[PDB]
Amino acid sequence: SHEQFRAALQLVVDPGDPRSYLDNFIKIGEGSTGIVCIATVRSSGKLVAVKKMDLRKQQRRELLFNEVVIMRDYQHENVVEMYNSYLVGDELWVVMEFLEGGALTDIVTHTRMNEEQIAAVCLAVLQALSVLHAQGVIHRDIKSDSILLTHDGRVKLSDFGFCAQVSKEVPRRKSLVGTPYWMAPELISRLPYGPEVDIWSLGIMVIEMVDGEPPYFNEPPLKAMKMIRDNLPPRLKNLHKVSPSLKGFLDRLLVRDPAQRATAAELLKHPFLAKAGPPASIVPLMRQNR
Amino acid sequence: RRRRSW
Ligand SMILES: [Mg+2]
Ligand SMILES: [Mg+2]
């Protein structure tokens, strides 16, 4: 059945082997579904990222089809560009744009962002989500680890491996998917859900940007999920460290009832986003600069 | 304190 799946993937990916044109693979990241290396394009000296995913090590192998088609068919200023995909032995390799600024996690765990910076991140993420959600694509794993940066502070959404599509014929999803601390309550409750789950997860990322970590982060994942499911929306550890504007914004994201939660389209009009700085305002937060 | 997806 692994052989069965390898054959299926071969029909969908690009032919060949990118080892023929790439040099000096260096591992830079470990994900939930595989590893990520930087590589040098031999002809150009340009750098790319290569996500390598072993078909034998997935919970749901068929989710790998998301890695082949989403980045390629849903392109945007604030979404990581994919170049090509290949079957290399037992692994799916995706060659994609290298986001040399690394992940937002490295910033939120090591420094404090001001509200100009938080708004810039939120604006970039919401622009991506408004376009994806209009097309029925739900990301389902929004967290700081999924937000990548360029050297010049541009913010891009990555890691669509666990995404799903909704449409008139399939208006909601049911799968238990995401990262425990960031999961929407309706998703934890196993109710049919839609794009709204990404907005909740974004609110949890706003808490990451303010506090350094999501709520209940010291609890075991299962216990955190119970608490998210059963409790009032999680509170900031330091409410005095956020403006009434940022609190009002957050109050539109962390709404338990998905019907009352703001949509990405609606949030793009929120006065909090008026504070967003240019990508330059993000630059000094990155490791190479701080 | 785990960050792994499910
Ligand atoms: Mg990941
Ligand atoms: Mg992923």
Numbering used by the authors:
A (entry chain A): 300 to 589
B (entry chain B): -4 to 1
From the study:
Most kinases in this group, including those in the mammalian Ste20-like (MST) kinase family, are Thr selective (Miller et al., 2008), while members of the p21-activated kinase (PAK) family are Ser selective (Rennefahrt et al., 2007). Here we show that a residue located in the kinase activation segment, which we term the “DFG+1” residue, acts as a major determinant for serine-threonine phosphorylation site specificity. To understand the structural basis for how the DFG+1 residue controls phosphoacceptor specificity, we determined the X-ray cocrystal structures of WT and F461V mutant PAK4 catalytic domains in complex with consensus peptide substrates incorporating both their favored and disfavored phosphorylation site residues (PAKtide-S and PAKtide-T). As previously observed for WT PAK4 in the absence of bound peptide (Eswaran et al., 2007; Ha et al., 2012), in each of the structures PAK4 is observed in the active state conformation with the activation loop phosphorylated on residue Ser474.
